[PDB]
Amino acid sequence: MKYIQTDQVLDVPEGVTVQIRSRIIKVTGPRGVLTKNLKHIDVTFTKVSNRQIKITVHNGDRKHVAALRTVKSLISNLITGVTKGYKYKLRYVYAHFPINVNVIEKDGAKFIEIRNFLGDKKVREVPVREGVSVDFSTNQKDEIVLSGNSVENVSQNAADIQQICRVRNKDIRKFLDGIYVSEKGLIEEEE
Amino acid sequence: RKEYQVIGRRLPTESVPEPKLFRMRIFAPNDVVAKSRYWYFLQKLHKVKKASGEIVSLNVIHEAHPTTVKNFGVWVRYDSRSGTHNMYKEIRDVTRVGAVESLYQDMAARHRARFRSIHILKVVELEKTADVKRQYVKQFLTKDLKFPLPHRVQKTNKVYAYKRPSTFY
Amino acid sequence: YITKMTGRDSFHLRVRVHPFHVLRINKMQQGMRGAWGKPHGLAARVAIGQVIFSVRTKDNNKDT
Amino acid sequence: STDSVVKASNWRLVEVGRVVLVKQGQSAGKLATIVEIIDQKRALIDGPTTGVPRQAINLGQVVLTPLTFAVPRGAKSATVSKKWAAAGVSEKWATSSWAKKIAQRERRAALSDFERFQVLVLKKQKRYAVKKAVAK
Amino acid sequence: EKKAEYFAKLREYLEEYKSVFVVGVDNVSSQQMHEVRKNLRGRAVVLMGKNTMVRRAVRGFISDFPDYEKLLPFVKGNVGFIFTNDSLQDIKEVIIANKVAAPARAGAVAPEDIWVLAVNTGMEPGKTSFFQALGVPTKIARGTIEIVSDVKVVDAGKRVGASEASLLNLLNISPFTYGLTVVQVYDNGQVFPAS
RNA sequence: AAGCGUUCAUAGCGACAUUGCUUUUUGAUUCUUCGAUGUCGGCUCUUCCUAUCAUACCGAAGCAGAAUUCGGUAAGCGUU
RNA sequence: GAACCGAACGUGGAGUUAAGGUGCCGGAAUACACGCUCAUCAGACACCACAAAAGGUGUUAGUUCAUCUAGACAGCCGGACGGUGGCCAUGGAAGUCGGAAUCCGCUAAGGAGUGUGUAACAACUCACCGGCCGAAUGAACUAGCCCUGAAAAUGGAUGG
RNA sequence: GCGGUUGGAUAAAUCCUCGGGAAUGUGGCUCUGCUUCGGUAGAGUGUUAUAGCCCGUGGGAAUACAGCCAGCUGGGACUG
């Protein structure tokens, strides 16, 4: 039927800000800064009362109004990241061969290296993306944690570690080995 | 599109003088089509035809207040490829004749129903904003309605242009 | 199917069409000389808006 | 800043009490209000002072001006003419840069050949004064 | 149909009996609520409710009864009425002292501080792996499984799992025996905090 | 989708019915050619099709591993 | 394109139409108005050069029925007993191999019970009702355009 | 491109007059407050008040559509 006007309301916290011209969204806050280009969408923004934005669409459709609500979620994750920061944990389920994990530097790139995975001789190598720190967990053994501002970069980097530890030619229900994601949430606790 | 009145009768036969008279509100392009569609619908009710009967009156029925917006509610029977189905659409138009015109366009667009396979059952002008059910009409019945028209375009009679034009409005 | 769901004595099925039409076939000396076919099988001829199967039941069942 | 910053936007809203210019038809180059909205590509208009009758029309055929005033939602003809004169919408229209450039080419169209010859002589006098002043 | 009965029947109380004595009953976990009412069967009548905030707001009008204005703010969380005018003191002793109890916890916020003791459990060798898996060190000193040295398994804070709840429900009490506690007391009027 | 498959309709299969596609089988027909289009195979040589036997990379299993079975994008390359 | 549509013909001039067309090739509106479709194989005009059953929450309209001032669906937790292992059956059947009964209590609500599980219990889980939250949601169907179904040999054809 | 007439509900409406009706309820007043107390925005109440709509009774015209003129004026082509 085409919805004549639809809209969703953002709510900004105290410390952070937003700078919007055309469709470029520079968010700044306590932790750092982030950006995102939404130049494939056709939406319009409106400042109301400092800590309140109205995103809206004028004469959309079924498919266009889907992208209205998703942009609310995309911008909110930048504000949630720049305030607190995201944290993705990982565990290595090993049966027979113990998996080793290190972070060795090479031209200032920083690659996460894996060796002796399922008795393989090939040394495997996953790069660290822009704006995400790799660290090891104290107390809890058999663990690795990724933390940063960008939810997109941290979650992608955690997935590439998981998907370059696959078992090939075997029955996967028997050979239950890899580096799986245990928890994913926020850095700042009590929230 | 006009909105004719067709009053028939049946013949004044010997034994039974004075037939009962029958009235219908027919929609048609001109006077010749109105009398044709009268006998079509009358043949699905009583034992009559064009040979055994006659038309008494033909009157045009103009709109009372044609410069006012109204919410119509039309009932329709139409024949698809498989069978025949009943419907109830709602239109936001200035006249009855204008509303019925736009219905034939909407039926042909969505359902591929032609003029021959559409029976207009009853047209009713609704009173209150509450009786209307459909959401696609109820968008325009709200308190203080405003909306822009994004992405305007021009129309040059000439071919060439020396500006690199804008779509501001 | 209806016996599995509810029970055998919860309905009365009735077929309201009988095969009387005998078909023909020309199975194969010559080719198509004296090509009158011989009886193959039976069938029933049906028009549009005609009942094939008829089932009377209680108001409780229906969906079965 | 530290208070946000959004650009943001500015459109001509179609609404009740939005005066509009007519492109084509029997009217063409007139003015009229929007009395009540119908739906998207459809609207009712009226403007009895300027000379244009009551009619349903497409919003593509019409064009929105940047002028507005208060009108009751779905008025008649005489009630609109009362509000039209009090606000002074005709006087505000004439002073705009749109209307002056509209009125310019109408005067250019009605020039006689003797009047066009005077435009040669007067414009040649201006060029001599401007060229001398720019040199210094 | 059904709300009409609940509309009408709620007007009968507090129009006798006149001491409302309200209590939840949120995480019960009963089983033994059933029996709290059946021990109250001789005297009292019980009625738990849903969103009757609109009901008690509308019933606040009446004209001849303005005493129901005190009952519409307190109903937060799982709460329901146990109206009975015996006294207020005697009913308080019967309901609270009975309590629910019963085991236990299967994936939620933990109980009071758990602390397993030493000395034989009463089990021949079989599940010494499951004891050592969740912290508890065991040493088989002749035959049966015996625990050596006392250590806390789960403190009051971090969650308790489903698999670890198997041995706790059978053998070692947490304890997570949680009973009902009274919210308010009435006898006019009268907003009594009950303490 | 009635049953088979220790248990379990659909891992793999699948009775009784029913809709199709194809012109590498064979019929049906006789429009072209009887003042002639040299009719069986093999040898030699080129290229095209995919309805994939192998090789590349994947999914499913009544896939522990090895071997095998069913399917996907694939005619690049090979087939004595 | 022998046969279809429109029209039957002496030689020339001016006007007007038939059938069929009006982005360009090509003479003639890149006219006007309301919808629908986006196809990693879109579709494009009678005879005429093909496509079906069966399916899709891709999207559009519609029919019949239900719940709604807390919707109820959400969707995350709380309960899921008392008589009771109900009678029977038999190694044992305790809601859960089965043959019929189908009743109460307390009731906000809890079937002599939806499955998982056990030799049978235990244990878990739904049905039904609360707690959090505040305005429309749930089921079964009908037909439009798109998609799967849809594989052939030199390079290729809505005329391009 | 203008003019004159005929018919229809002797067009229908607008406009004028006499009634009725309510809401996407104007003004006021109510009311939580919010305030730079300047003014404010929301709900609430109720039938024109400092906005105005909808439906019909009565009255008198224009205009549109359709017809006719043995009405009036201009431009261009072919034929002798």
Short mmCIF file of all heavy atoms in Angstrom, two decimals, chain B residues 56-101:
data_model
loop_
_atom_site.label_atom_id
_atom_site.label_comp_id
_atom_site.label_asym_id
_atom_site.label_seq_id
_atom_site.Cartn_x
_atom_site.Cartn_y
_atom_site.Cartn_z
N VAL B 56 -39.21 3.02 -20.31
CA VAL B 56 -40.11 4.14 -20.05
C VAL B 56 -39.35 5.47 -19.94
O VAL B 56 -39.76 6.46 -20.54
CB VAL B 56 -40.97 3.89 -18.78
CG1 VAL B 56 -41.75 5.13 -18.36
CG2 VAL B 56 -41.92 2.73 -19.01
N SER B 57 -38.25 5.47 -19.18
CA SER B 57 -37.49 6.70 -18.91
C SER B 57 -35.97 6.50 -18.94
O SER B 57 -35.47 5.43 -18.60
CB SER B 57 -37.90 7.26 -17.54
OG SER B 57 -37.34 8.55 -17.32
N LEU B 58 -35.26 7.54 -19.37
CA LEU B 58 -33.80 7.61 -19.30
C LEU B 58 -33.39 8.99 -18.78
O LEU B 58 -33.59 10.00 -19.46
CB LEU B 58 -33.17 7.38 -20.68
CG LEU B 58 -32.97 5.94 -21.16
CD1 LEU B 58 -32.44 5.95 -22.58
CD2 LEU B 58 -32.02 5.17 -20.24
N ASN B 59 -32.81 9.02 -17.57
CA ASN B 59 -32.42 10.27 -16.91
C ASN B 59 -30.97 10.20 -16.44
O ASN B 59 -30.53 9.16 -15.93
CB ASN B 59 -33.32 10.53 -15.69
CG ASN B 59 -34.80 10.41 -16.00
OD1 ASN B 59 -35.54 9.73 -15.28
ND2 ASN B 59 -35.24 11.05 -17.07
N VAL B 60 -30.23 11.29 -16.62
CA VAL B 60 -28.88 11.43 -16.07
C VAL B 60 -29.01 11.87 -14.61
O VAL B 60 -29.86 12.70 -14.29
CB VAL B 60 -28.03 12.46 -16.85
CG1 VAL B 60 -26.62 12.57 -16.26
CG2 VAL B 60 -27.96 12.09 -18.33
N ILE B 61 -28.17 11.30 -13.74
CA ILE B 61 -28.17 11.63 -12.31
C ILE B 61 -26.83 12.28 -11.96
O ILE B 61 -25.85 11.59 -11.68
CB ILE B 61 -28.41 10.39 -11.43
CG1 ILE B 61 -29.74 9.70 -11.80
CG2 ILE B 61 -28.42 10.77 -9.95
CD1 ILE B 61 -29.84 8.27 -11.32
N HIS B 62 -26.80 13.62 -12.00
CA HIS B 62 -25.61 14.39 -11.64
C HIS B 62 -25.39 14.38 -10.13
O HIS B 62 -26.33 14.16 -9.36
CB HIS B 62 -25.73 15.83 -12.15
CG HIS B 62 -25.87 15.93 -13.63
ND1 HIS B 62 -24.85 15.62 -14.50
CD2 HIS B 62 -26.92 16.31 -14.40
CE1 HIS B 62 -25.26 15.80 -15.75
NE2 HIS B 62 -26.51 16.23 -15.71
N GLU B 63 -24.15 14.62 -9.72
CA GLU B 63 -23.78 14.62 -8.30
C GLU B 63 -24.32 15.86 -7.60
O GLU B 63 -24.42 16.94 -8.20
CB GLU B 63 -22.25 14.55 -8.15
CG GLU B 63 -21.74 14.21 -6.75
CD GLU B 63 -22.07 12.79 -6.33
OE1 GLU B 63 -21.86 11.85 -7.12
OE2 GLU B 63 -22.53 12.60 -5.18
N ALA B 64 -24.68 15.71 -6.32
CA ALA B 64 -25.24 16.79 -5.52
C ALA B 64 -24.18 17.84 -5.18
O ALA B 64 -24.35 19.02 -5.48
CB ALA B 64 -25.87 16.25 -4.25
N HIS B 65 -23.09 17.38 -4.57
CA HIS B 65 -21.98 18.24 -4.17
C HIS B 65 -20.67 17.70 -4.77
O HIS B 65 -19.90 17.02 -4.09
CB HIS B 65 -21.89 18.31 -2.64
CG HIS B 65 -23.15 18.79 -1.99
ND1 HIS B 65 -23.44 20.13 -1.82
CD2 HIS B 65 -24.20 18.12 -1.46
CE1 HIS B 65 -24.62 20.26 -1.23
NE2 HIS B 65 -25.10 19.05 -1.00
N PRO B 66 -20.43 18.00 -6.07
CA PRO B 66 -19.26 17.44 -6.78
C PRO B 66 -17.90 18.08 -6.46
O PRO B 66 -16.89 17.61 -6.99
CB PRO B 66 -19.62 17.67 -8.25
CG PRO B 66 -20.49 18.87 -8.25
CD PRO B 66 -21.26 18.84 -6.96
N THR B 67 -17.86 19.13 -5.64
CA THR B 67 -16.60 19.76 -5.21
C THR B 67 -16.34 19.51 -3.71
O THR B 67 -15.99 20.44 -2.97
CB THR B 67 -16.61 21.27 -5.52
OG1 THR B 67 -17.63 21.92 -4.75
CG2 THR B 67 -16.86 21.52 -7.00
N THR B 68 -16.51 18.26 -3.29
CA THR B 68 -16.28 17.84 -1.90
C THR B 68 -15.73 16.40 -1.88
O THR B 68 -16.21 15.55 -2.63
CB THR B 68 -17.57 17.88 -1.06
OG1 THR B 68 -18.60 17.12 -1.70
CG2 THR B 68 -18.05 19.32 -0.86
N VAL B 69 -14.75 16.15 -1.02
CA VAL B 69 -14.12 14.83 -0.92
C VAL B 69 -15.00 13.90 -0.07
O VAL B 69 -15.49 14.31 0.98
CB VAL B 69 -12.70 14.91 -0.31
CG1 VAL B 69 -12.06 13.52 -0.24
CG2 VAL B 69 -11.82 15.86 -1.13
N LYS B 70 -15.18 12.67 -0.55
CA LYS B 70 -16.05 11.68 0.11
C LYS B 70 -15.38 10.30 0.13
O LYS B 70 -14.56 9.99 -0.73
CB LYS B 70 -17.39 11.59 -0.62
CG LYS B 70 -18.25 12.85 -0.51
CD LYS B 70 -19.49 12.76 -1.38
CE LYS B 70 -19.22 13.14 -2.83
NZ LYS B 70 -19.05 14.60 -3.04
N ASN B 71 -15.76 9.48 1.12
CA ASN B 71 -15.24 8.12 1.27
C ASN B 71 -16.31 7.10 0.90
O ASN B 71 -17.23 6.83 1.68
CB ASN B 71 -14.78 7.89 2.72
CG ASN B 71 -13.58 8.75 3.10
OD1 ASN B 71 -12.61 8.85 2.35
ND2 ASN B 71 -13.65 9.37 4.27
N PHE B 72 -16.18 6.53 -0.31
CA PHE B 72 -17.13 5.54 -0.82
C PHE B 72 -16.73 4.12 -0.45
O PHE B 72 -15.56 3.83 -0.21
CB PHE B 72 -17.25 5.66 -2.35
CG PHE B 72 -17.78 6.99 -2.81
CD1 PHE B 72 -16.92 8.01 -3.19
CD2 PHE B 72 -19.16 7.22 -2.87
CE1 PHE B 72 -17.41 9.24 -3.62
CE2 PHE B 72 -19.65 8.45 -3.30
CZ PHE B 72 -18.78 9.46 -3.67
N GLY B 73 -17.73 3.23 -0.40
CA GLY B 73 -17.53 1.81 -0.11
C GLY B 73 -18.31 0.96 -1.10
O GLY B 73 -19.53 0.85 -1.00
N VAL B 74 -17.60 0.35 -2.05
CA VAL B 74 -18.21 -0.36 -3.18
C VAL B 74 -18.13 -1.88 -3.01
O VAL B 74 -17.07 -2.41 -2.68
CB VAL B 74 -17.52 0.03 -4.51
CG1 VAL B 74 -18.32 -0.49 -5.71
CG2 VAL B 74 -17.33 1.54 -4.60
N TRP B 75 -19.26 -2.55 -3.24
CA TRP B 75 -19.33 -4.02 -3.28
C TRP B 75 -19.27 -4.48 -4.74
O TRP B 75 -19.90 -3.87 -5.61
CB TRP B 75 -20.62 -4.53 -2.63
CG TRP B 75 -20.58 -4.56 -1.13
CD1 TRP B 75 -20.34 -5.65 -0.34
CD2 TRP B 75 -20.78 -3.45 -0.24
NE1 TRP B 75 -20.38 -5.29 0.99
CE2 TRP B 75 -20.65 -3.95 1.08
CE3 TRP B 75 -21.06 -2.09 -0.42
CZ2 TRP B 75 -20.79 -3.14 2.21
CZ3 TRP B 75 -21.20 -1.28 0.71
CH2 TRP B 75 -21.06 -1.81 2.00
N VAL B 76 -18.52 -5.55 -5.00
CA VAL B 76 -18.28 -6.04 -6.37
C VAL B 76 -18.28 -7.58 -6.44
O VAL B 76 -17.73 -8.25 -5.56
CB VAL B 76 -16.95 -5.48 -6.93
CG1 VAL B 76 -16.44 -6.26 -8.15
CG2 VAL B 76 -17.10 -4.01 -7.29
N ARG B 77 -18.91 -8.11 -7.49
CA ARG B 77 -18.78 -9.50 -7.91
C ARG B 77 -17.99 -9.49 -9.22
O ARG B 77 -18.30 -8.71 -10.12
CB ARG B 77 -20.16 -10.14 -8.10
CG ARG B 77 -20.20 -11.37 -9.01
CD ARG B 77 -21.55 -12.06 -8.97
NE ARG B 77 -21.71 -13.03 -10.06
CZ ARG B 77 -22.76 -13.83 -10.24
NH1 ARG B 77 -23.79 -13.81 -9.39
NH2 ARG B 77 -22.78 -14.66 -11.27
N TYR B 78 -16.97 -10.35 -9.32
CA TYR B 78 -16.16 -10.47 -10.54
C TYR B 78 -15.78 -11.92 -10.83
O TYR B 78 -15.66 -12.73 -9.92
CB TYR B 78 -14.91 -9.57 -10.44
CG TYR B 78 -13.71 -10.20 -9.75
CD1 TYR B 78 -12.64 -10.70 -10.49
CD2 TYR B 78 -13.65 -10.29 -8.36
CE1 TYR B 78 -11.54 -11.28 -9.86
CE2 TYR B 78 -12.56 -10.86 -7.72
CZ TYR B 78 -11.51 -11.36 -8.48
OH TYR B 78 -10.42 -11.93 -7.85
N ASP B 79 -15.59 -12.22 -12.12
CA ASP B 79 -15.28 -13.58 -12.58
C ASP B 79 -13.80 -13.71 -12.95
O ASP B 79 -13.30 -13.01 -13.83
CB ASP B 79 -16.13 -13.94 -13.80
CG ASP B 79 -17.62 -14.01 -13.48
OD1 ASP B 79 -18.11 -13.16 -12.71
OD2 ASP B 79 -18.30 -14.91 -14.01
N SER B 80 -13.10 -14.62 -12.25
CA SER B 80 -11.71 -14.96 -12.55
C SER B 80 -11.66 -16.09 -13.60
O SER B 80 -12.70 -16.48 -14.14
CB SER B 80 -10.99 -15.38 -11.26
OG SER B 80 -11.54 -16.58 -10.73
N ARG B 81 -10.46 -16.59 -13.89
CA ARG B 81 -10.29 -17.74 -14.79
C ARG B 81 -10.93 -19.01 -14.22
O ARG B 81 -11.62 -19.74 -14.94
CB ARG B 81 -8.80 -18.01 -15.06
CG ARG B 81 -8.10 -16.93 -15.88
CD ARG B 81 -6.59 -17.16 -15.91
NE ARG B 81 -5.84 -15.95 -16.27
CZ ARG B 81 -4.51 -15.85 -16.29
NH1 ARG B 81 -3.73 -16.89 -15.99
NH2 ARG B 81 -3.95 -14.69 -16.63
N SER B 82 -10.70 -19.27 -12.94
CA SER B 82 -11.20 -20.47 -12.27
C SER B 82 -12.69 -20.39 -11.96
O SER B 82 -13.47 -21.24 -12.40
CB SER B 82 -10.43 -20.73 -10.97
OG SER B 82 -9.04 -20.90 -11.23
N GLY B 83 -13.09 -19.36 -11.21
CA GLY B 83 -14.48 -19.17 -10.78
C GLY B 83 -14.87 -17.71 -10.65
O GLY B 83 -14.39 -16.87 -11.41
N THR B 84 -15.75 -17.42 -9.69
CA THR B 84 -16.24 -16.06 -9.43
C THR B 84 -16.18 -15.75 -7.93
O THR B 84 -16.48 -16.62 -7.10
CB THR B 84 -17.67 -15.84 -9.99
OG1 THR B 84 -18.18 -14.57 -9.54
CG2 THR B 84 -18.64 -16.95 -9.56
N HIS B 85 -15.79 -14.52 -7.60
CA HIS B 85 -15.50 -14.11 -6.22
C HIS B 85 -16.17 -12.78 -5.87
O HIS B 85 -16.41 -11.95 -6.75
CB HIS B 85 -13.99 -13.98 -6.00
CG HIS B 85 -13.19 -15.06 -6.66
ND1 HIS B 85 -13.14 -16.36 -6.18
CD2 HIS B 85 -12.41 -15.05 -7.77
CE1 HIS B 85 -12.37 -17.09 -6.96
NE2 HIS B 85 -11.91 -16.32 -7.93
N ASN B 86 -16.47 -12.60 -4.58
CA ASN B 86 -17.06 -11.36 -4.06
C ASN B 86 -15.99 -10.53 -3.36
O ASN B 86 -15.04 -11.08 -2.81
CB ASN B 86 -18.19 -11.69 -3.07
CG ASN B 86 -19.32 -12.47 -3.71
OD1 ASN B 86 -19.09 -13.34 -4.55
ND2 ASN B 86 -20.55 -12.17 -3.31
N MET B 87 -16.16 -9.21 -3.38
CA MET B 87 -15.19 -8.27 -2.80
C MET B 87 -15.85 -7.01 -2.22
O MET B 87 -17.01 -6.72 -2.51
CB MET B 87 -14.16 -7.86 -3.86
CG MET B 87 -13.15 -8.94 -4.21
SD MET B 87 -11.75 -8.30 -5.14
CE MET B 87 -10.57 -9.64 -4.96
N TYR B 88 -15.08 -6.29 -1.40
CA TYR B 88 -15.49 -5.00 -0.84
C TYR B 88 -14.29 -4.06 -0.75
O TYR B 88 -13.51 -4.12 0.20
CB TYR B 88 -16.14 -5.19 0.54
CG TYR B 88 -16.47 -3.90 1.26
CD1 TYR B 88 -17.41 -3.01 0.74
CD2 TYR B 88 -15.85 -3.56 2.47
CE1 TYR B 88 -17.72 -1.82 1.39
CE2 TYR B 88 -16.15 -2.38 3.13
CZ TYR B 88 -17.09 -1.51 2.59
OH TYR B 88 -17.39 -0.34 3.24
N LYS B 89 -14.14 -3.21 -1.77
CA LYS B 89 -13.09 -2.18 -1.80
C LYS B 89 -13.61 -0.86 -1.23
O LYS B 89 -14.82 -0.71 -1.02
CB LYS B 89 -12.60 -1.97 -3.24
CG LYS B 89 -11.89 -3.17 -3.84
CD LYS B 89 -11.40 -2.88 -5.25
CE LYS B 89 -10.43 -3.94 -5.75
NZ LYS B 89 -9.13 -3.93 -5.02
N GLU B 90 -12.70 0.07 -0.99
CA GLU B 90 -13.03 1.42 -0.52
C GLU B 90 -12.18 2.47 -1.23
O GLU B 90 -10.97 2.30 -1.38
CB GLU B 90 -12.86 1.51 1.00
CG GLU B 90 -14.05 0.96 1.77
CD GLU B 90 -13.86 1.02 3.28
OE1 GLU B 90 -12.79 0.60 3.77
OE2 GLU B 90 -14.80 1.46 3.97
N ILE B 91 -12.83 3.55 -1.65
CA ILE B 91 -12.23 4.57 -2.51
C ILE B 91 -12.42 5.96 -1.90
O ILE B 91 -13.45 6.23 -1.27
CB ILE B 91 -12.85 4.55 -3.94
CG1 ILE B 91 -12.98 3.11 -4.46
CG2 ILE B 91 -12.02 5.39 -4.90
CD1 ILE B 91 -13.77 2.98 -5.75
N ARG B 92 -11.43 6.83 -2.09
CA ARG B 92 -11.45 8.21 -1.61
C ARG B 92 -11.47 9.15 -2.82
O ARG B 92 -10.42 9.55 -3.32
CB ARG B 92 -10.24 8.47 -0.71
CG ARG B 92 -10.17 9.86 -0.10
CD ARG B 92 -9.17 9.89 1.05
NE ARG B 92 -8.82 11.26 1.45
CZ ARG B 92 -9.59 12.07 2.18
NH1 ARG B 92 -10.79 11.69 2.63
NH2 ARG B 92 -9.14 13.29 2.48
N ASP B 93 -12.68 9.47 -3.29
CA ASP B 93 -12.88 10.23 -4.53
C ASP B 93 -13.92 11.34 -4.35
O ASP B 93 -14.65 11.37 -3.35
CB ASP B 93 -13.32 9.26 -5.65
CG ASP B 93 -12.77 9.65 -7.01
OD1 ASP B 93 -12.86 10.84 -7.39
OD2 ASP B 93 -12.25 8.76 -7.72
N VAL B 94 -13.98 12.25 -5.32
CA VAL B 94 -14.84 13.45 -5.24
C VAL B 94 -16.30 13.20 -5.65
O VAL B 94 -17.20 13.89 -5.16
CB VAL B 94 -14.21 14.62 -6.05
CG1 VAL B 94 -14.49 14.50 -7.55
CG2 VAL B 94 -14.66 15.97 -5.50
N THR B 95 -16.54 12.23 -6.54
CA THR B 95 -17.90 11.87 -6.99
C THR B 95 -18.11 10.36 -7.04
O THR B 95 -17.15 9.58 -6.92
CB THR B 95 -18.20 12.45 -8.39
OG1 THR B 95 -17.18 12.04 -9.32
CG2 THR B 95 -18.27 13.98 -8.36
N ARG B 96 -19.37 9.95 -7.22
CA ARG B 96 -19.72 8.54 -7.41
C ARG B 96 -19.22 8.03 -8.76
O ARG B 96 -18.61 6.96 -8.83
CB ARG B 96 -21.24 8.34 -7.33
CG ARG B 96 -21.83 8.51 -5.93
CD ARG B 96 -23.35 8.50 -5.96
NE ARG B 96 -23.89 7.27 -6.55
CZ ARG B 96 -24.02 6.09 -5.94
NH1 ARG B 96 -23.63 5.92 -4.67
NH2 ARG B 96 -24.53 5.06 -6.60
N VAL B 97 -19.49 8.79 -9.82
CA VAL B 97 -19.02 8.48 -11.18
C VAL B 97 -17.48 8.43 -11.28
O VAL B 97 -16.94 7.62 -12.03
CB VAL B 97 -19.61 9.45 -12.23
CG1 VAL B 97 -19.05 10.87 -12.08
CG2 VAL B 97 -19.38 8.93 -13.64
N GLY B 98 -16.80 9.30 -10.53
CA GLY B 98 -15.34 9.30 -10.45
C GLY B 98 -14.80 8.11 -9.67
O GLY B 98 -13.75 7.56 -10.03
N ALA B 99 -15.50 7.73 -8.60
CA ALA B 99 -15.11 6.59 -7.77
C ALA B 99 -15.25 5.25 -8.51
O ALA B 99 -14.36 4.41 -8.44
CB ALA B 99 -15.94 6.56 -6.49
N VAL B 100 -16.37 5.08 -9.21
CA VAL B 100 -16.62 3.86 -10.00
C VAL B 100 -15.63 3.73 -11.17
O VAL B 100 -15.21 2.62 -11.49
CB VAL B 100 -18.10 3.79 -10.49
CG1 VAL B 100 -18.31 2.64 -11.48
CG2 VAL B 100 -19.04 3.63 -9.30
N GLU B 101 -15.27 4.85 -11.78
CA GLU B 101 -14.24 4.88 -12.83
C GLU B 101 -12.89 4.34 -12.33
O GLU B 101 -12.27 3.51 -12.99
CB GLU B 101 -14.08 6.31 -13.38
CG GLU B 101 -12.99 6.52 -14.44
CD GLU B 101 -13.22 5.73 -15.72
OE1 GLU B 101 -12.99 4.50 -15.72
OE2 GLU B 101 -13.65 6.34 -16.72
#
